[PDB]
Amino acid sequence: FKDPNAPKRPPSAFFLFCSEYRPKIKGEHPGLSIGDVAKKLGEMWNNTAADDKQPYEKKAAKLKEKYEKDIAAYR
């Protein structure tokens, strides 16, 4: 992803949109789906009261990806 002291192609997963609705492979729960993390991107604000409970949008991939923050983090 690289060059001799010179940019990475910065690592971040964007696949995991659902951060607190999906992830329950942890405690009581051997099963929640691999699809439950990527196609349900409205999660966190749908835990609040009746004020502003709508959005969740942005993410961050890896592969070439982050040309705006931290491709400088090896450039």
Partner: protein, 211 residues
């Protein structure tokens, strides 16, 4: 959107052809209402092959929230959608949502007339900037031209909770008459649309008996 602390992402300059609503903005559909640099179809949406910056879209789900200075306003609207005209806007919002609860500061009541006034407490917020005062304390009409009734500005200030502004009635002619009845009128607006305010008193120089 355009006058709200809320949602997100559709591209204008005013009433010429090619102008969807909610700020901001990202290409040429020109200038002077809004926050980003450029003036049309907008997303730093994020995801996909430009997850660095964005996901730009042709179906029209492309995202950034709100208002400002330089994006969808005053233009001779040849900034290619097609058309066409000299049209205008400018908008910058402040916060308002579902309201509530009372707000309390600034209360002290009785020193009748004559000397430096001390604490005079009547309320509001909301201007660019807030306002003024006068010289009062509390009641029926004042007495003219005696020893100086004075400023509000030792009252318990707070500008933007909505709980101190102007009280404008003129004892420019000050008083030594008697009872707590020189000047009084202050009464104005509450504070904030999540929890609002309420109102308080005139401004106070003491009368006495060193009899």
């Amino acid at each position: 959107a355009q006058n709200i602390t809320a949602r997100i992402g559709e591209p204008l300059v005013l009433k010429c052809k090619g102008a969807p609503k909610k700020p901001p903005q990202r290409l040429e559909w020109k200038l002077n209402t809004g926050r980003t640099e450029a003036w049309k179809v907008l997303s730093p949406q994020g995801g996909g092959p430009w997850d660095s910056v964005a996901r730009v879209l042709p179906n029209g789900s492309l995202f950034l929230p709100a208002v400002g200075i330089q994006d969808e306003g005053i233009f001779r609207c040849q900034a290619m959608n097609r058309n066409g005209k000299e049209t205008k806007s400018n908008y910058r919002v402040r916060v308002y949502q579902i309201p509530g609860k009372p707000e309390i500061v600034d209360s002290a009541s009785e020193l009748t007339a004559g000397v430096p006034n001390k604490v005079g407490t009547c309320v509001s917020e909301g201007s660019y900037p807030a306002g003024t005062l006068s010289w009062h304390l509390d009641g029926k009409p004042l007495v003219p031209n005696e020893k100086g009734v004075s400023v509000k500005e030792q009252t318990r200030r707070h500008p933007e909770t909505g709980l101190f502004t102007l009280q404008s009635e003129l004892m420019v002619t000050p008083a030594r008459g008697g009872d707590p009845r020189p000047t009084f009128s202050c009464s104005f607006s509450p504070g904030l649309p999540r929890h609002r305010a309420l109102r308080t008193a005139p401004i106070q120089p003491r009368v006495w008996e060193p009899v």
